[PDB]
Design a protein around this motif. Structure first.
Motif, PDB file in Angstrom:
ATOM      1  N   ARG A 240       0.826  -1.211   0.000  1.00 38.73           N
ATOM      2  CA  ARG A 240       0.000   0.000   0.000  1.00 38.73           C
ATOM      3  C   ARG A 240       0.857   1.255   0.000  1.00 38.73           C
ATOM      4  N   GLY A 241       2.146   1.094   0.264  1.00 37.07           N
ATOM      5  CA  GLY A 241       3.047   2.241   0.294  1.00 37.07           C
ATOM      6  C   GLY A 241       3.252   2.898   1.666  1.00 37.07           C
ATOM      7  N   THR A 242       2.977   2.162   2.739  1.00 34.31           N
ATOM      8  CA  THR A 242       3.184   2.697   4.080  1.00 34.31           C
ATOM      9  C   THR A 242       4.360   1.947   4.720  1.00 34.31           C
ATOM     10  N   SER A 243       5.025   2.565   5.697  1.00 33.53           N
ATOM     11  CA  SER A 243       6.035   1.820   6.442  1.00 33.53           C
ATOM     12  C   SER A 243       5.174   1.008   7.407  1.00 33.53           C
ATOM     13  N   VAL A 244       5.772   0.088   8.154  1.00 32.01           N
ATOM     14  CA  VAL A 244       4.953  -0.809   8.956  1.00 32.01           C
ATOM     15  C   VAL A 244       5.773  -1.245  10.171  1.00 32.01           C
ATOM     16  N   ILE A 245       5.132  -1.348  11.331  1.00 30.18           N
ATOM     17  CA  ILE A 245       5.901  -1.635  12.553  1.00 30.18           C
ATOM     18  C   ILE A 245       5.349  -2.765  13.399  1.00 30.18           C
ATOM     19  N   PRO A 246       5.439  -3.985  12.867  1.00 39.00           N
ATOM     20  CA  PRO A 246       4.925  -5.137  13.606  1.00 39.00           C
ATOM     21  C   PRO A 246       5.647  -5.359  14.933  1.00 39.00           C
ATOM     22  N   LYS A 247       4.883  -5.720  15.959  1.00 36.64           N
ATOM     23  CA  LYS A 247       5.464  -6.015  17.273  1.00 36.64           C
ATOM     24  C   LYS A 247       5.451  -7.512  17.621  1.00 36.64           C
ATOM     25  N   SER A 248       6.555  -8.028  18.146  1.00 40.18           N
ATOM     26  CA  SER A 248       6.543  -9.393  18.690  1.00 40.18           C
ATOM     27  C   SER A 248       7.590  -9.399  19.783  1.00 40.18           C
ATOM     28  N   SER A 249       7.374 -10.182  20.834  1.00 36.88           N
ATOM     29  CA  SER A 249       8.380 -10.307  21.873  1.00 36.88           C
ATOM     30  C   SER A 249       9.093 -11.661  21.666  1.00 36.88           C
ATOM     31  N   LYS A 250       8.792 -12.341  20.562  1.00 37.67           N
ATOM     32  CA  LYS A 250       9.395 -13.658  20.253  1.00 37.67           C
ATOM     33  C   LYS A 250      10.452 -13.558  19.156  1.00 37.67           C
ATOM     34  N   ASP A 251      11.688 -13.994  19.426  1.00 41.13           N
ATOM     35  CA  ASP A 251      12.732 -13.899  18.405  1.00 41.13           C
ATOM     36  C   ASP A 251      12.322 -14.527  17.075  1.00 41.13           C
ATOM     37  N   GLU A 252      11.673 -15.690  17.113  1.00 45.46           N
ATOM     38  CA  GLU A 252      11.272 -16.349  15.868  1.00 45.46           C
ATOM     39  C   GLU A 252      10.356 -15.474  15.009  1.00 45.46           C
ATOM     40  N   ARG A 253       9.410 -14.792  15.648  1.00 47.72           N
ATOM     41  CA  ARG A 253       8.478 -13.939  14.920  1.00 47.72           C
ATOM     42  C   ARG A 253       9.128 -12.638  14.496  1.00 47.72           C
ATOM     43  N   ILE A 254      10.033 -12.118  15.323  1.00 43.51           N
ATOM     44  CA  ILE A 254      10.732 -10.899  14.949  1.00 43.51           C
ATOM     45  C   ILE A 254      11.443 -11.177  13.606  1.00 43.51           C
ATOM     46  N   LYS A 255      12.089 -12.342  13.495  1.00 45.52           N
ATOM     47  CA  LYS A 255      12.773 -12.710  12.252  1.00 45.52           C
ATOM     48  C   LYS A 255      11.760 -12.929  11.135  1.00 45.52           C
ATOM     49  N   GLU A 256      10.702 -13.678  11.439  1.00 37.05           N
ATOM     50  CA  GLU A 256       9.633 -13.965  10.463  1.00 37.05           C
ATOM     51  C   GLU A 256       9.042 -12.685   9.854  1.00 37.05           C
ATOM     52  N   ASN A 257       8.815 -11.702  10.711  1.00 36.05           N
ATOM     53  CA  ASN A 257       8.153 -10.460  10.305  1.00 36.05           C
ATOM     54  C   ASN A 257       8.887  -9.556   9.350  1.00 36.05           C
ATOM     55  N   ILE A 258      10.173  -9.798   9.152  1.00 35.14           N
ATOM     56  CA  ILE A 258      10.887  -8.953   8.231  1.00 35.14           C
ATOM     57  C   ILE A 258      11.228  -9.696   6.936  1.00 35.14           C
ATOM     58  N   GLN A 259      10.790 -10.950   6.803  1.00 33.77           N
ATOM     59  CA  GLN A 259      11.055 -11.702   5.549  1.00 33.77           C
ATOM     60  C   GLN A 259       9.958 -11.344   4.550  1.00 33.77           C
ATOM     61  N   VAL A 260       9.876 -10.063   4.214  1.00 35.45           N
ATOM     62  CA  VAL A 260       8.818  -9.565   3.349  1.00 35.45           C
ATOM     63  C   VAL A 260       9.310  -8.853   2.117  1.00 35.45           C
ATOM     64  N   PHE A 261      10.524  -9.190   1.676  1.00 40.01           N
ATOM     65  CA  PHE A 261      11.103  -8.585   0.472  1.00 40.01           C
ATOM     66  C   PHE A 261      11.450  -9.702  -0.520  1.00 40.01           C
ATOM     67  N   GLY A 262      11.313  -9.428  -1.804  1.00 44.87           N
ATOM     68  CA  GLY A 262      11.631 -10.473  -2.760  1.00 44.87           C
ATOM     69  C   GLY A 262      10.438 -11.285  -3.212  1.00 44.87           C
ATOM     70  N   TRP A 263       9.244 -10.819  -2.860  1.00 44.91           N
ATOM     71  CA  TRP A 263       8.002 -11.449  -3.308  1.00 44.91           C
ATOM     72  C   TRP A 263       6.879 -10.427  -3.142  1.00 44.91           C
ATOM     73  N   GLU A 264       5.726 -10.706  -3.733  1.00 41.98           N
ATOM     74  CA  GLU A 264       4.592  -9.796  -3.638  1.00 41.98           C
ATOM     75  C   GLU A 264       3.286 -10.559  -3.506  1.00 41.98           C
ATOM     76  N   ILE A 265       2.242  -9.856  -3.085  1.00 44.05           N
ATOM     77  CA  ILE A 265       0.928 -10.460  -2.982  1.00 44.05           C
ATOM     78  C   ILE A 265       0.284 -10.174  -4.364  1.00 44.05           C
ATOM     79  N   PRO A 266      -0.193 -11.206  -5.075  1.00 43.28           N
ATOM     80  CA  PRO A 266      -0.820 -10.991  -6.384  1.00 43.28           C
ATOM     81  C   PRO A 266      -1.979  -9.996  -6.230  1.00 43.28           C
ATOM     82  N   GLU A 267      -2.192  -9.182  -7.249  1.00 42.22           N
ATOM     83  CA  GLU A 267      -3.238  -8.174  -7.223  1.00 42.22           C
ATOM     84  C   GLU A 267      -4.619  -8.676  -6.811  1.00 42.22           C
ATOM     85  N   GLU A 268      -5.050  -9.816  -7.348  1.00 40.08           N
ATOM     86  CA  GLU A 268      -6.369 -10.339  -6.992  1.00 40.08           C
ATOM     87  C   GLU A 268      -6.460 -10.603  -5.485  1.00 40.08           C
ATOM     88  N   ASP A 269      -5.375 -11.089  -4.877  1.00 39.74           N
ATOM     89  CA  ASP A 269      -5.388 -11.359  -3.429  1.00 39.74           C
ATOM     90  C   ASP A 269      -5.249 -10.069  -2.640  1.00 39.74           C
TER      91      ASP A 269
END
Ligand code: NDP
Length: 308
Positions: A240-269
């Motif tokens: 959508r073009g906004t920065s984003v600040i997900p919160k987690s106190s779990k190391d696994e999720r902190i890592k999971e939450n930034i693996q968001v580059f190198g792919w996209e959500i198809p337009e229909e979805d």
């Protein structure tokens, strides 16, 4: 893009670590996010009561080799300090807790002044008038004195934004607002885009209260992309073009939450996610500012200037 350029010319990383209700592992989370997961943006606030721990985490990350100039730290001034004479002391206290000489972004946390010792929900007389112009002038002085690189606002409305823009000598760099499927707030987003103000999406996963990781619509998209529901919710914000600040106190999720580059959500979805009706708002501000018996705000609509 992995970063946004603010009007001042300062770069802001697209993904940041939220720290609201981070708990006892706050320091550890911040250090792990920055070193192991590559985060270069941390979002906190004096009212979260965790800035001393965030400071310890930032210190440890800098001691680990990360340079201060490469980190983006955001904090926010609380309602009780929204009076001209209280701005500077509130910011100095925050820098002390964070162990920093300056912060990259300082936001008006909510555009309402609260009396010292105000309760939740507020009693009669506890919600005061916000001298937006006078308080903002002192926020600008923080930039002039190099204590803050950029200033912004959270939880605004279009009417409040237009009022601020008629007065501001330094316009807000960023407007941080609750945004996620089910609460797009396209109205505030369009007003910010119109004025070149960057937008940061808070509670991108719907927070804990309206968490969307188990929502069937989000799950359906996640399964087709082989991504986690949290990754789909965070990627939706970036798309959508906004920065984003997900919160987690779990190391696994902190890592999971930034693996968001190198792919996209198809337009229909992406469109299916955008189609979820806007009604899922987590933070209405009612427990902070509404007293229906005495006012000044008698409903959530009064808090949002009847704009949503
Ligand atoms: N300006 C303002 O008024 C506000 C600003 N904010 C800022 O925005 C940040 C983010 O918003 P916030 O409301 O905290 O919540 P988020 O939308 O980031 O949701 C956090 C919740 O999701 C869980 N969670 C985190 N990652 C995942 C994942 N990958 N899958 C499933 N569940 C997950 C967390 O649990 P766990 O920790 O157990 O992983 C927690 O319960 C705040 O921390 C704060 O920095 C938030 C509210 C208001």
């Amino acid at each position: 893009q992995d970063h946004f350029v603010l009007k001042s010319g300062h770069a802001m990383p697209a993904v940041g670590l939220g720290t609201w209700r981070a708990g006892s592992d706050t320091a550890h989370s911040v250090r792990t996010a920055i070193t192991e997961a590559g985060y270069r943006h941390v979002d906190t606030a004096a009212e979260y009561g965790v800035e001393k721990e965030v400071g310890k985490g930032l210190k440890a990350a800098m001691e680990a080799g990360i340079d201060r100039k490469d980190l983006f730290v955001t904090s926010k001034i609380w309602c009780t300090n929204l009076a001209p004479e209280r701005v500077r002391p509130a910011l100095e206290n925050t820098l002390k807790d964070l162990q920093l000489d300056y912060i990259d972004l300082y936001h008006i946390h909510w555009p309402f002044r609260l009396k010292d010792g105000a309760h939740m929900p507020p009693e009669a007389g506890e919600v005061l008038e916000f001298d937006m112009e006078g308080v903002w002038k002192e926020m600008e002085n923080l930039v002039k004195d190099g204590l803050v690189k950029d200033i912004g606002v959270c939880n605004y409305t279009v009417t409040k934004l237009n009022r601020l823009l008629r007065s501001a000598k330094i316009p807000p760099a960023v407007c941080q607002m609750e945004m996620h499927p089910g609460w797009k707030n396209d109205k505030i987003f369009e007003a910010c885009k119109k004025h070149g103000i960057h937008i940061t999406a808070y509670s991108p996963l719907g927070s804990s209260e309206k968490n969307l990781a188990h929502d069937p619509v989000v799950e359906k998209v996640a399964n087709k992309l082989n991504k986690t529901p949290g990754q789909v919710l965070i990627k939706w914000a970036l798309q959508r073009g906004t920065s984003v600040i997900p919160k987690s106190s779990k190391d696994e999720r902190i890592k999971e939450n930034i693996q968001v580059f190198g792919w996209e959500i198809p337009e229909e979805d992406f469109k299916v996610l955008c189609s979820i009706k806007d009604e899922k708002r987590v933070l209405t501000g009612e427990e902070l500012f509404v007293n229906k018996t005495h006012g000044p705000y008698r409903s959530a609509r009064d808090v949002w200037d009847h704009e949503n």
